[PDB]
Design a protein around this ligand. Structure first.
Ligand code: CLA
Ligand code: CLA
Ligand code: CLA
Ligand code: CLA
Ligand code: CLA
Ligand code: CLA
Ligand code: CLA
Ligand code: CLA
Ligand SMILES: CC(/C=C/C=C(C)/C=C/[C@@]12O[C@]1(C)C[C@@H](O)CC2(C)C)=C\C=C\C=C(C)\C=C\C=C(C)\C=C\[C@@]12O[C@]1(C)C[C@@H](O)CC2(C)C
Ligand SMILES: CC1=C(/C=C/C(C)=C/C=C/C(C)=C/C=C/C=C(C)/C=C/C=C(C)/C=C/C2=C(C)CCCC2(C)C)C(C)(C)CCC1
Ligand code: SF4
Ligand code: SF4
Lengths: 80, 97, 64, 41, 206, 193, 161
C-alpha cells in the first residue's frame, strides 16, 4: 500500500496515532526525546493515504511522512 | 579573373598559415581540449567502438606533425577563400561609398 | 551544557525549517544524554500549521 | 471614546473614510477640471 | 536654549544647536541618519552662496535699470542675447570649469584636509579649518574669517540666514516672473502702488 | 592619489608599475592575471595609436587628404591606391589585404608565443637596435612611453568621434576651424545643437 | 508628422466629430422646452463638449486618420505633457504611498503587538508618517546609499534548493 515513514525529529506526542482512522501507527519505546517514545507504522498495508497523521504532527516539518502509491483494495477505501 | 591562379594562391596562403604560423596554436588548443569525454572518460573508453580515433589515417612523416586531415582542413579553408574572392571579383556589384 | 544559553537569540540553519534564516528565543535545552534535538526555540511568527515553536540540535543554531 | 476611536481606526472603517475622501476629491477635481487627456504645462 | 522655528516644539536630537543657523527645523527628518547632516550642511552652504549671487545679479541690475543707470535686459531674457561667444560653447566651458572647481570641492567634502595645496605650485597652501569655508589668499583675502575668534558662529549665522533669504527670494522671482511676466522690481512697485488688487490671488485667478 | 589627489588607491594597484596612477573606478583589474592581460593590451593599443597618429596627420598636412578619405579609393571600383601622389601598381583590393593578413598574422603569432609577461610587454633584444636599455633611465622611459601612449589613445578616439561629428573633414582641418572661430565651433555644436 | 499624424487643429475628422456630437446633442434638445431643466442639462453638455474640443485643439494633440487624438510616449519634447509629465507626477504619488506605508510598517515592527497595529491603524502615528512622504525620494536615496533600504540576503527566509 502506501509508505509511511517516521523521522528522528519526532517528539512522541502521540497526536499522529490518535488521528489515524485505520490504526496504522503506534507508539514504541525510544530514547531520542523527552517523551521516551517514537511513532512507528508496522501495518501500513491498512493505510488509506488521508495524511491526517501529517496534519496532527506539530514539528516544523513533519516527523511522519506519507508517500502514497500502490492503491490496493484497502488503500482505495472500497466497501464493494 | 583567373580561377586557377586565385585558387592556387589562396590555398597556398592558407596552407602556409596553417603549417607555420597557426600550427603551434592549433596543437596547443587540441592538447588543452583533448578528446571529447562522455562522462569522466572518453567515448571510446565508455564502450563506443565507432568513436576510436583513426590512428592509421592520422599517421604522418611531416617533421612538424602536419597531418593529411590538417591538409584537408586548411585546403578547404583556402578553396573557400579563393572561391569567395572569385565570386566577389566576378560579381559586378559596386556599392559606390 | 549542550547548546545555547536559555533566552538567547539564535538563528536557524535547518534548510527544511519554516524559520530558516530567522531569529528565535531559546526556551529550554535538555541535558539528557541521547536527545537528538534538545534546544527549544520560540518564534515571533507562526508557520503554516500555526506552530510558533520547534526543537533543534545545537549544530543547526548559530548565535545571531 | 477610547473604544469608539479604536473601532473607527479599524482597517475597514479607515479604508471607507480614506477612499471616500479620495473619491470626493477626484470627483470635485473632475467637476472643475474635466475631460483632460494632456497635462497642460 | 536657542529660539526654534515652532515655539513649544522639541528640536530634533540630531540638531544639537551648535551648528550655525540652527533653529530645530527638520520636521521631515531629512538629516536623521548619522553622517548625512554634514552633506546637507555643505549643500545648503553652496545653495545659499549661489542664491545670494543670483539675487544680487537679478534684483540689483533690474533695480538700477529701473532707476536709469546701468540699463540691462531682463534676467529671464538675458539668455537670448548676443555675446562675443556662442551660448552653447559658453555652457560647455562653464561645465568644464565648474567640473574642476566642484571636483576639488567634492574631494574636500569626501575627506577634509586633502585638497588644500596648489597642484602646480606645492608652496601655496590654501588651508581652512572647517569644511565649507576654504580659507586662504583666495576666498578670504581680508582675513575676516579663518578662525579669528573661537566659535565663529555669529558671522556664519549671518551668512546662512542671508542665504536662506536669498534662496526664497530667487524662487519667488522665478515663479512670479513665470506667472506675471514682469520684472521683480516692477512687481514690487505694482504691489506698493495697489497692494489690494495685485497679489497672488489676482495673478493666478484674476 | 595621482589621478585624484587624496583618493585611496585600490589594493591591486600599488603604484610601482609604469603609469600606475590608481585609476580604476570600475574595478576591472581586481583579478591579477586579468590585470596583467590588461597591461599588455594597453601597451599594444597605445603603441598602435602612437604609430597611427603621424599616419593621420602627416598625409593631411602634405596635401594627400585626411585619414577618413584614405580608404575612399577602396570604396570606388578600381581605386588605384596612391603613395605620396605616386600610384601603387600593386594596390588593387584583393592583394594588399591578403598581404596584410599574412604578415600581421605572422607577427601576431610570434608575439603570442612568448611565456614571460615582462617580455610580453617589453621584449627588447632585437627590438632595441639603439640600446636604450643599458642606462638607468629605463623605468622613467617606460613611464614616458605609457604617458605619450594614453595621450595618443585619447587623440585617436578624438579623431574617430570628430569623423562621425563632421564627415568629410580631417582632424587638422578641424583644428583650423577651431583656430578660426574658437568661440562658435566647439564640441557644443554636436552635443547641444 | 510623428508617424503621419496631423495636428488636431487642422484635422477634418476632429471637426467632423465636433459637428456630429453637437448635432446629436441639439437633436436630443429639440424635444424639450427651452426653460426646462433637461434643456439646461443638455446645453451644459454642449458647452462642455465645445470647451473639451477647444482644449484638445489648443494643446497640439496629434489626430490620426479621422479625428482621434493619439499620444506620443517616445519622449518627444513637443509631447512631454502626455506621458512624461503626468508619469512623473504618478511616480511621485505612488512612491509617496509606498514609502509612507513602508515607514509605518517599520515603525510598528518595534511595537509589542504589531498585528493589532496593522488591523487597527495608529492614526496619529500613521498621520505623522504620511506627513514625511513630501520628500520621499530624498529619504529613499539616503536609505539606499546608507544601506538601510535593502535587507541582506543572509537574514531572509528561503526555501530549500
Ligand atoms: C490605468 C489605466 C487608466 C489610466 C492611465 C487613466 C487615465 C485617465 N482617465 Mg481613465 N479610467 C480607467 C483607467 C485609467 N484611466 C478605468 C479603469 C475607468 C473605469 C472606471 C476609467 C474611467 C474614466 C472616466 C470616466 C474618465 C477617465 C479620465 C481619465 C483622465 C483623467 C482622470 C483624472 O482625474 O484626471 C484629473 C487629474 C487629476 C485628478 C490629477 C491628480 C491630482 C493629485 C491629487 C495630485 C496633486 C498634485 C501633486 C501633489 C503634485 C504633483 C506635481 C505638480 C507639479 C503637478 C486620464 C487620462 C477622465 C478624463 O478626463 O478623460 C480623458 C474621465 O472623464 N477615466
Ligand atoms: C523656515 C522654516 C519655518 C517654518 C515652516 C515656520 C512655520 C511657522 N512658524 Mg516659525 N520660525 C522660523 C522658521 C519657520 N517657521 C524661524 C527661523 C523663527 C525664528 C526663531 C521662527 C519663529 C517663530 C515664532 C516666534 C512663531 C512661529 C510660528 C510659526 C507658525 C505660524 C506662521 C504662519 O502660519 O504664518 C503667518 C505669517 C505671518 C503672520 C507673517 C508656522 C507653522 C508661530 C506659531 O504659530 O507658533 C506655534 C510663532 O509664534 N515661528
Ligand atoms: C536646497 C536647499 C537647502 C538645503 C540643502 C538645506 C539643508 C538644511 N537646512 Mg535649510 N533652508 C532652506 C534650504 C535648504 N536647507 C531654505 C530655503 C530655508 C528657508 C525656508 C531653510 C531654512 C532652514 C532652517 C530654519 C533650518 C534649516 C536646517 C537645515 C538642515 C536640516 C536638514 C534638512 O532637512 O535639510 C535638507 C533639505 C533638503 C534636502 C531640501 C529639500 C527640498 C524639498 C524636497 C523641496 C522644497 C520645498 C518646495 C518645493 C520649495 C519651497 C516652496 C516655497 C513656497 C517656500 C540642513 C543642513 C536646520 C538646521 O539644522 O540648521 C542649520 C534649521 O534649523 N534650514
Ligand atoms: C549667479 C551669478 C550670476 C550670473 C549667472 C550672472 C549672469 C549674467 N550677468 Mg551678472 N552679476 C552678478 C551675478 C551673476 N550674473 C552680480 C552679483 C552682479 C553685481 C550686482 C552682476 C552684475 C552684472 C552687470 C553689471 C551685468 C551683468 C550681466 C550679466 C549677463 C550677461 C553675461 C555676463 O555675465 O556678463 C559678461 C561677463 C562679465 C561682465 C564678467 C566680466 C568680464 C568682462 C570682460 C570684464 C548674464 C546673464 C550683463 C547684462 O545684463 O547683460 C546682458 C551686465 O551688464 N551682471
Ligand atoms: C523674499 C520673499 C518674497 C517676497 C518679498 C515676495 C514679494 C511679492 N511677491 Mg512673491 N513669491 C515668493 C517669495 C516672495 N515674494 C515665493 C517663494 C514664491 C513661490 C511660491 C512667490 C510667488 C509669487 C507669485 C506667483 C506672485 C508673487 C507676488 C508678489 C508680490 C505680492 C505679494 C503676493 O502675491 O503674495 C506673495 C505670495 C507668495 C506665494 C509668496 C509666499 C512666501 C513669502 C516668503 C511670504 C510681492 C512683490 C505677486 C506679484 O508679482 O504681484 C505684483 C504674484 O503674482 N509672488
Ligand atoms: C599604423 C600605421 C600606418 C598605417 C596603417 C598607414 C596606412 C596608410 N598610409 Mg600612412 N604613415 C604612417 C603610418 C601608417 N600609415 C606613418 C608612421 C607615416 C610617417 C612616415 C605615414 C605617412 C604616410 C604618407 C606620407 C602617406 C601615407 C599613406 C598611407 C596609405 C597608403 C598605403 C601606404 O602607406 O603605402 C605604402 C606602400 C608600401 C610601403 C609598399 C594607407 C592608408 C598615403 C596616403 O594617404 O594615400 C592615400 C601617403 O601619401 N602614410
Ligand atoms: C614616445 C613614445 C615612446 C617611448 C617613450 C618609448 C619608450 C620605450 N620603448 Mg616603445 N614603442 C613606441 C613608442 C615609445 N616607446 C611605439 C610607437 C612603438 C611601436 C612601433 C613602440 C614599440 C616598442 C617595442 C616593440 C619595444 C619598445 C621598447 C621601449 C623601451 C626602449 C626604447 C626606448 O627608450 O624608446 C625611446 C623612444 C624615443 C626616444 C622616441 C623617439 C621618437 C622616434 C625618433 C620616432 C619618431 C619619428 C616620427 C615622429 C614618427 C614616425 C614613425 C617612424 C617609425 C616611421 C622604452 C621603455 C622596448 C623595450 O621596452 O624593451 C626593453 C621594446 O621591446 N617599444
Ligand atoms: C587631447 C585630445 C583632443 C584634442 C586636442 C581635441 C581638440 C579639439 N576637438 Mg576633439 N575630441 C577628443 C579629444 C580631443 N579633441 C575626444 C576624446 C573626443 C570624444 C569625446 C572628441 C570629440 C570631439 C567632437 C565631437 C568635436 C571635437 C572638436 C574639437 C575642436 C574644438 C572643441 C574643443 O576645444 O575641444 C573639446 C574637446 C573635448 C570636450 C574632448 C578641437 C580642435 C570639435 C570640432 O572639431 O569643431 C571644430 C567637435 O565638433 N572633438
Ligand atoms: C528655495 C530653495 C530651497 C528651499 C528648500 C526648502 C524650503 C526646504 C525645506 C525643508 O527641507 C527642510 C529645510 C527641512 C525639512 O525637514 C522640511 C522641508 C520643508 C522639506 C533653494 C533655492 C536655491 C536658489 C538658487 C540655487 C538660485 C540660483 C540662482 C541662479 C542660478 C540665477 C541665475 C540667473 O543668473 C541670474 C543670477 C542672472 C540672470 O541674468 C540669468 C540667470 C541665469 C537666470
Ligand atoms: C608534397 C610536399 C609538398 C607540397 C605539397 C602540396 C602543395 C600539397 C597541397 C595540397 C592541397 C592544395 C590540398 C587541398 C585541399 C583542398 C580541399 C580539401 C578543398 C576543399 C574545397 C571545398 C569542399 C570547396 C567547396 C565549394 C566551393 C568553395 C566552391 C563551390 C561550392 C562548394 C561549397 C562545393 C612540398 C613540395 C612543399 C614538399 C613537402 C611535401
Ligand atoms: S495517511 Fe491516514 S491512514 Fe495512513 S498513516 Fe496517516 S493518518 Fe493513518
Ligand atoms: S510523528 Fe509527529 S504527531 Fe506523531 S508522535 Fe511523532 S511528533 Fe507526535
Amino acid at each position: 500500500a502506501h509508505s509511511v515513514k517516521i523521522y528522528d525529529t519526532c517528539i512522541g506526542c502521540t497526536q499522529c496515532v490518535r488521528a489515524c482512522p485505520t490504526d496504522v501507527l503506534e507508539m514504541v519505546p525510544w530514547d531520542g526525546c523527552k517523551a521516551s517514545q517514537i511513532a512507528s507504522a508496522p501495518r501500513t498495508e491498512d493505510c488509506v493515504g488521508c495524511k491526517r497523521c501529517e496534519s496532527a504532527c506539530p514539528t516544523d516539518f513533519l516527523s511522519v511522512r506519507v508517500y502514497l502509491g500502490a492503491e490496493t483494495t484497502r488503500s482505495m477505501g472500497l466497501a464493494y | 579573373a583567373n580561377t586557377a591562379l586565385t585558387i592556387t594562391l589562396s590555398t597556398g596562403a592558407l596552407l602556409f598559415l596553417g603549417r607555420f604560423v597557426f600550427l603551434p596554436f592549433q596543437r596547443d588548443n587540441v592538447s588543452r581540449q583533448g578528446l571529447p569525454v562522455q562522462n569522466g572518460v572518453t567515448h571510446f573508453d565508455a564502450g563506443d567502438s565507432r568513436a576510436q580515433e583513426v590512428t592509421s589515417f592520422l599517421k604522418t612523416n611531416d617533421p612538424a606533425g602536419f597531418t593529411i586531415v590538417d591538409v584537408l582542413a586548411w585546403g578547404a579553408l583556402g578553396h573557400a577563400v579563393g572561391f569567395f574572392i572569385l565570386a566577389t571579383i566576378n560579381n559586378g556589384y559596386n556599392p559606390q561609398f | 551544557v549542550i547548546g545555547p544559553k536559555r533566552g538567547s537569540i539564535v538563528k536557524v540553519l535547518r534548510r527544511e525549517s519554516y524559520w530558516f534564516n530567522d531569529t528565535g528565543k531559546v526556551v529550554a535545552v535538555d541535558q539528557a544524554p541521547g536527545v537528538r534535538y534538545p534546544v527549544v526555540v520560540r518564534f515571533d511568527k507562526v508557520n503554516y500549521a500555526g506552530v510558533s515553536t520547534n526543537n533543534y540540535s545545537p549544530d543547526e543554531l548559530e548565535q545571531s | 471614546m477610547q473604544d469608539v476611536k479604536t473601532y473607527l481606526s479599524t482597517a475597514p472603517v479607515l479604508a471607507t473614510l480614506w477612499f471616500g475622501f479620495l473619491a470626493g476629491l477626484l470627483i470635485e477635481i473632475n467637476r472643475f477640471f474635466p475631460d483632460a487627456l494632456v497635462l497642460p504645462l | 536654549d536657542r529660539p526654534l522655528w515652532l515655539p513649544g516644539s522639541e528640536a530634533p536630537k540630531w540638531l544639537d544647536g551648535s551648528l550655525p543657523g540652527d533653529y530645530g527645523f527638520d520636521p521631515l527628518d531629512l538629516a536623521a541618519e548619522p553622517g548625512r547632516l554634514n552633506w546637507m550642511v555643505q549643500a545648503e552652504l553652496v545653495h545659499c552662496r549661489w542664491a545670494m549671487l543670483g539675487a544680487a545679479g537679478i534684483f540689483i541690475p533690474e533695480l538700477l535699470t529701473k532707476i536709469g543707470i546701468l540699463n540691462t535686459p531682463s534676467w529671464y531674457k538675458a539668455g537670448d542675447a548676443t555675446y562675443f561667444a556662442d551660448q552653447g560653447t559658453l555652457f560647455i566651458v562653464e561645465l568644464l570649469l565648474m567640473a574642476w572647481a566642484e571636483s576639488r570641492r567634492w574631494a574636500d567634502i569626501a575627506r577634509p584636509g586633502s585638497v588644500n595645496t596648489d597642484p602646480i605650485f606645492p608652496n601655496n597652501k590654501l588651508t581652512g579649518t572647517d569644511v565649507g569655508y576654504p580659507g586662504g589668499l583666495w576666498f578670504d583675502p581680508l582675513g575676516w574669517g579663518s578662525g579669528s575668534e573661537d566659535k565663529l558662529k555669529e558671522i556664519r549665522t549671518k551668512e546662512v540666514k542671508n542665504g536662506r533669504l536669498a534662496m526664497l527670494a530667487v524662487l519667488g522671482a522665478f515663479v512670479q516672473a513665470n506667472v506675471t511676466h514682469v520684472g521683480p522690481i516692477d512687481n514690487l512697485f505694482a504691489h506698493l502702488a495697489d497692494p489690494y488688487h495685485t497679489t497672488i490671488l489676482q495673478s493666478l485667478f484674476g | 592619489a595621482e589621478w585624484l589627489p587624496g583618493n585611496p588607491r585600490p589594493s591591486y594597484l600599488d603604484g610601482s608599475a609604469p603609469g600606475d596612477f590608481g585609476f580604476d573606478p570600475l574595478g576591472l583589474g581586481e583579478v591579477p592575471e586579468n590585470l596583467e592581460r590588461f597591461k599588455e593590451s594597453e601597451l599594444i593599443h597605445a603603441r598602435w595609436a602612437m604609430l597611427a597618429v603621424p599616419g593621420v596627420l602627416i598625409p593631411e598636412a602634405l596635401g594627400y587628404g585626411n585619414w577618413v578619405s584614405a580608404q575612399k579609393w577602396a570604396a570606388t571600383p578600381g581605386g588605384q591606391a596612391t603613395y605620396l601622389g605616386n600610384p601603387v601598381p600593386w594596390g588593387n583590393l584583393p592583394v594588399i589585404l591578403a598581404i596584410e593578413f599574412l604578415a600581421i598574422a605572422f607577427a601576431e603569432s610570434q608575439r603570442n608565443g612568448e611565456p614571460d609577461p615582462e617580455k610580453r610587454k617589453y621584449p627588447g633584444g632585437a627590438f632595441d637596435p639603439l640600446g636604450f636599455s643599458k642606462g638607468a633611465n629605463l623605468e622613467e622611459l617606460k613611464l614616458k612611453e605609457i604617458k605619450n601612449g594614453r595621450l595618443a589613445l585619447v587623440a585617436f578616439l578624438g579623431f574617430a568621434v570628430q569623423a562621425i561629428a563632421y564627415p568629410g573633414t580631417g582632424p587638422l582641418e578641424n583644428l583650423k576651424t577651431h583656430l578660426a572661430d574658437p568661440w562658435h565651433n566647439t564640441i557644443a555644436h554636436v552635443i547641444i545643437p | 508628422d510623428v508617424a503621419g499624424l496631423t495636428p488636431c487643429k487642422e484635422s477634418k475628422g476632429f471637426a467632423k466629430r465636433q459637428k456630429q456630437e453637437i448635432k446629436k446633442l441639439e437633436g436630443r434638445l429639440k424635444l424639450y422646452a427651452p426653460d426646462s431643466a433637461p434643456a439646461l442639462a443638455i446645453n451644459a453638455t454642449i458647452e462642455k463638449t465645445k470647451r473639451r474640443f477647444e482644449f484638445y485643439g489648443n494643446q497640439g494633440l496629434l489626430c490620426g486618420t479621422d479625428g482621434l487624438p493619439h499620444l506620443i510616449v517616445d519622449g518627444d519634447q513637443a509631447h512631454l505633457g502626455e506621458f512624461v509629465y503626468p508619469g512623473l507626477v504618478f511616480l511621485y504619488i505612488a512612491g509617496w504611498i509606498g514609502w509612507v506605508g513602508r515607514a509605518y510598517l517599520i515603525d510598528v515592527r518595534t511595537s509589542k503587538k504589531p498585528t493589532e497595529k496593522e488591523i487597527i491603524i495608529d492614526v496619529p502615528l500613521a498621520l505623522r508618517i504620511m506627513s514625511k512622504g513630501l520628500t520621499w525620494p530624498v529619504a529613499a536615496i539616503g536609505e539606499l546609499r546608507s544601506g538601510k533600504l535593502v535587507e541582506k540576503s543572509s537574514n531572509i527566509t528561503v526555501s530549500p534548493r
